[PDB]
């Protein structure tokens, strides 16, 4: 049970069954997924990215560690990923609004997480009422490393698909930031470096459209990535 793809080893762990690597994979997943979103939606120019291989069959641009502006974002995303180790991260999302600080989003790329108790088969309860993303992910079973690779490949191709064919062009002016939510288990003291505490998150207008990007199921974690937008079709 290992991922033997020669390209996969550069960005990702070869084994994702154990909790430490399961969590670290999730961290890397977040990095590559939001990299694809930021580049393919053209929120950031190509110069902020480095061309990479996810596998032998798929290439993807990822946030450049050698550029200051892009390194900041990557670090911030990595801080969020580290929260998956103890299970303190419910959701991390890129939120696009007309104006900075707006509650209501024009477009959202959301990744939502669920956690498993020791053994990686029993889903830990996640509530506000059952979290909307809990059920689909909880039903999921870890089907080995290559399924995880294929899941990652699906998500990347999906992000490319949505941006090229489905999503209408963004407005001339907008503001984009990252907004997250903690789990219930998360201590009050614990805080993800790079994110200021807030009692507000984001909201979507009632006629919002959606599209499933893909789901991830390593050994001891689960996640679902979705696109919420006013600019579909």
């Amino acid at each position: 049970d290992s991922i033997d793809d020669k390209k996969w080893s550069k960005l990702f762990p070869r084994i994702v069954s154990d909790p430490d690597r399961s969590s670290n994979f999730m961290t890397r997943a977040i990095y590559v997924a939001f990299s694809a979103v930021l580049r393919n939606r053209n929120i950031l120019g190509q110069e902020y990215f480095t061309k990479n291989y996810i596998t032998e069959k798929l290439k993807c641009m990822t946030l450049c560690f050698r550029n200051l502006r892009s390194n900041q974002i990557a670090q911030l995303l990595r801080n969020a990923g580290d929260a998956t180790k103890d299970g303190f991260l419910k959701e991390v999302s890129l939120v696009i609004t007309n104006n900075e600080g707006d509650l209501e989003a024009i477009e959202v790329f959301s990744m939502k997480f669920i956690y498993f108790e020791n053994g990686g088969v029993v889903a830990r309860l996640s509530t506000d009422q059952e979290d909307p993303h809990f059920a689909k992910l909880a039903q999921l079973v870890y089907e080995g490393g290559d399924s995880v690779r294929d899941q990652m490949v699906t998500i990347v191709r999906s992000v490319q698909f949505l941006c090229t064919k489905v999503l209408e062009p963004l407005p001339e002016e907008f503001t984009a930031n990252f907004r997250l939510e903690y789990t219930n288990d998360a201590p009050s003291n614990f805080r993800i470096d790079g994110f200021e505490d807030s009692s507000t998150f984001y909201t979507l207008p009632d006629d919002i459209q959606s599209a499933t990007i893909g789901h991830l199921r390593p050994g001891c974690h689960a996640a679902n990535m979705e696109c919420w937008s006013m600019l579909m079709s």
């Binding site: 929120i43 950031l44 900041q72 974002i73 911030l76 900075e100 506000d128 963004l170 001339e172 002016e173 907008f174 503001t175 984009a176 930031n177 990252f178 907004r179 997250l180 939510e181 903690y182 219930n184 998360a186 009050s188 805080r191 993800i192 790079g194 994110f195 200021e196 505490d197 807030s198 009692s199 507000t200 998150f201």
Partner: peptide, 13 residues
């Protein structure tokens, strides 16, 4: 209940 907002942001004008 509890949320976090990135100090970093991206602006288009």
């Amino acid at each position: 209940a509890r949320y976090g907002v990135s100090n970093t942001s991206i602006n288009r004008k």
